[PDB]
Every structure is written in structure tokens, then in C-alpha cells.
Amino acid sequence: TYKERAATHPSPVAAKLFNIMHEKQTNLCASLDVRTTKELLELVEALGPKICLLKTHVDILTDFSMEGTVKPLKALSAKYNFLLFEDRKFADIGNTVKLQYSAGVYRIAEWADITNAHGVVGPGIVSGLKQAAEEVTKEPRGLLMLAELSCKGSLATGEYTKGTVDIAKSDKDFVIGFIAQRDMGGRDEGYDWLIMTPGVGLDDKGDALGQQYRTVDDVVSTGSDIIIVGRGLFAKGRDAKVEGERYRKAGWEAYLR
Template identity: 50%
Template sequence: VWYGMVWYCLVWYGTVRYARMKLAGPLNDVGLKTTDVVVLVDREQGGATNLKDRGVTPHAVLKISQMCKCLVKHKRLSMEIVGKVATFLKENQVVIRPKPEEKKKKDDKPKRALTYEARAEKCKNKTATKLLKIMAEKKTNLCFSADITDKKRLLEVVEAVGPHICMLKTHIDTLEDFDMDVAKKLRALADKYNFIIFEDRKYADIGNTVVLQYSKGIYRPVEWADIVNAHPLPGPGIVEGLKKNGGPAGRGLVLIAEMSSKGNLATGAYTEASIKMALEYPDYVMGFISMRKLTDSPGIIHMTPGVKLVKGGDGMGQQYNTPELVLAEKLSDLIIVGRGIYQAKDPKAEAAMYREAGWAAYEKSLTS
């Protein structure tokens, strides 16, 4: 079942005791997280206790004691036999104390090891360092996705939300009245309010083509955008092509390792290949578009789209998660919010709310 950007698998087993021995343990051994076990019969010999001690919640359709009561009620079992069953169960408890590494607590939450400030000192890409420092100084992990098609409206909204964001994400090719003047004005606002500009271009071609797309034509993002992004699909040539002009200009590249839309194909082996590709270019690839933390590399900034204050969807495949889920539980670094802000009656006030929620979730995720 696909729910909340995670695949869930339900495994049914016969009894609690064997679920622990033959199911929960082996699944954990291969890196899967076992949270709940559904069984047909709890024989009440300690299996449920063993699971709970390891942070796994058992769910039994029936218990031996319930079965006995039902059989007695319908005169299929005598009280004498029920007494013998009860004695047997009491004298044959199998409680296996968990090893230290097996112990889990339901309230255990994943924690991030380093603050934004600490990570800024470990980055090999200058833009990544700058972004993490801005996030720490302004106390914001909010990126505003400005999917606005009119440059006057675009500049007005960015002016309003600028104090609350660490990054502005544009789709510059959707502007109906684009000229390089708007790019210059966005650059001036970025300097005024101290935020990064991220052009969400989603390059997906061979190296030679993206060289031209990045630095030629009417948009020329290399001249004004601190960051662009790309699909890893074409292979490392796309990174090499963008780096040709972006590297000397001190820019950064974000790879799209995962997406927030339902049914997308950026999963599994594709995501793993994206991680490997990114780690081969630590001086240029500075982050991922992803739904969660994918690597412990301090120089990789995880940016998660599809965020609203309340979970839900838009009827077109987009799935929204909350700042709390994205930052405190999935340990992403930065939330990307678009319609939740620019469709609000007061974008400035709404941005302030997202900023507060995002920062609170970040602080909650820290180890100290």
C-alpha cells in the first residue's frame, strides 16, 4: 500500500511466537523496520511480551484463553481441560530478553547529528556552505516555490516573504512577460533579504545540450541562479555538462532523487544510483530533491517539496506532508512550499507560519 510517501507491507503469520522468531528478526536483519505484527493466534506463552520488548506491536485475532471460553460456552470443552491448558501455559512461558541492540522504544525518534552551522563548515560546495549559514542565521529552513506567471506579482510576493525564507525557487520559463530585468531584480531581492535563488529547471539531457540550456538562450540561469537541478537519468554526463559553467561560477547542483507526486518512478534502484552519482561530485552536487534524508554526508542538503501545514493532496497526484513529518521524522533539511503561501490571502503572514513550524520541527530533531 502506498501512503504518505512510504510503501507499507502487511505480513500475516500464524502465531505470535513464530512471528517473532521467523518474521520480525529476519526482516530487521535485512534493514527493514518491523513496527507491527498481525497473527491469527496468540498462544499466550510470552510471544507478545517478546515483541513489545523489541518495540513491535502485536495484533492477535484470537487468544488461547478466548478460544477456551468460547468452546466452554458452546459445550465443546470441559472446565477440567481448560484448567490443564491454563496450567500448561503458565508453566511454559518463553520469554527471551532482548539484546541491547534489539531494544526499541515507541517514542524513539530519529535525530540529526549535526546542526546547520556545523555542517556548513564541512561542505565542499560554496553555495551549500552559504545556504546552511543563511538557514542558521535567519533561523529558517523555508524555501518559497514561486510558481507565478506574472513578473509584477512575482516580485511583490518575493518582497513580502523575503525576510522569512532561506531560498527562493523559481520556474522562470513560466513567466509570460520574462526579461532579464526580472532576473536582476530577483537577484537584488536575494541580496537584500539574504536568501539563495534556485531555478527549478529540471535538466534532463546529454552534457552538450545542458551546457547550452544553462548558459545560452533567453534565460541563462548560470548568470543569476545560485542553484539549478537535474534528473540523474542521462548519467554523469549531465553533471559534467552543468559543472562546466556552473563550477567556475561557484554555483551548486541539486539532483532529483525522489519526487512527491503519486506513482512517480524515482524510487528504489534509481534513487540509490542518484545518491552514488551525487557523492562522486562533492564540490558541485550540493543536495537532493527527496522526501527524506538519503545520506549522512554533511554537504548534501535534502530539500523536500509537497509540504503544507496539513496533510492532503491536490487531486492531480501531488501529495502533501507536514513540516513536522518532513523535518522531525524524515530528517530532511529544508521544506519547499508554493501554493500554501502564494495562494494565501496574506503570503507574508503565511510564510511566517511555515517558517515557525519548520524551525520548531528542526529544533525538535536535534540530539541536543
């Protein structure tokens, strides 16, 4: 169970997340990909009590600022009890990602509990991101490797996926799991990887740019620990609060089954 995994997971970030999921009876991660901080904060407020994690793309915000975007996000995170996951998908050499994660305008390492990286770069990407994390904050940080993607024509399969899983094995305390479409095993080698799965929608089938959706029951059935839902919650005139409860209920019941 999530509660049991919280006590045995080497990562304090994964542990806190598992506890949040148990306490709030939710394995839903909201991906409120809107372009203004104002709307983002309104949506986060509406989804707050129903999520365990908020996945953000701060780089699609036309008005990002540390004081106006990050501080309010941290306040909501504390108020409603959910972690912050900046979906930056780092994918450059170690030295460059260290610079991109630690500072710049977004100063991601300062506030995001979790972030992610593509395995394409090799082991150096993990080393670079961790060095950045330790140089900027004393707060625990977690990293997810991108093992698979939900988009049409994805190349994150076969040997590439295996190579990405190998990269993840280098740091059990820092690399907490994967963004993937199925279980990645690892139990046999002392790994308890969190499996977070995007490309989840109960209504949409996909979009005009390669996105593909699978149902909640479907992904949970293949090993997903957390469902990441974006447009299924807030787009096309949908009521985020209502969709939030709807998806939380579906994800939690699937987990219980």
C-alpha cells in the same frame, strides 16, 4: 546543526545557505509559482525576511526578461539575504543541458546560485552542467540531484534512486545534495548532503494532478533540512506574508526538536 555544517561543507554555496538558515532562523524555501514578473516580485518581497532560499520556475513567466525579472530578483536576494534556486530540472544529455543552462533566453547559469537535475541521464548531466557553469560565471554554483518526488506514481524509487545517488557522489564540491522525501545517508562516505523537500503543505492534501503533501513536522522528522512550500503560501487566496511566518515557525521549531 546548520551553523556547524556551514563550516565543514565542501560547497561554498551550501555553506552560505547553512549560514543564512542559522542567521535568519529559517529553513523555509518559497516556491512562488505565479505567471507574471510583477506578482512574483511582490510575493518575493513579502516572503524575503522569512526564507533562506527562493525556488523559481522562470519558465512559467509570461513576461520574463533579464533586466526586469532577474535583476530585481538578484536585488531582493541581496536585500533580504536568501539564495536563488532555478528549478529547471535539467534532464537531457550533457551537451544539451550545457547549452540550456549556460544561455538561451533565461541564461540560468548567470544568476541562479543553485539548480537541479534528474539522474535519468547518467553522469554526463553533471559534467555538462558544471562545464556550463564554469564557462559562464566565476561565481560558485551548486547542483541538487532529484532523488525522489512527491507526486503520485513517481518512478524515482529503488534502483533509480540509488543510481541517482551514485551520480551525486561524483562531485562533492558541486553536487550539494538532493531534492528528496527522506534522508539519503552518505555520512559514512564523507558526504553531508542537503535534503530539500517539496510536497509540503499544512492544509492542502494534494491537487488534481498527482501532487501530494506532507506536513512540516512529518518531513523534518524524516531528514529534511529545507522545506519547499509553494501553493501553501500564496494560493487559494492565502496571505503569503502570514503563511511565510507560519511555515518558518513550524519548520524552525521542528528542526530544533
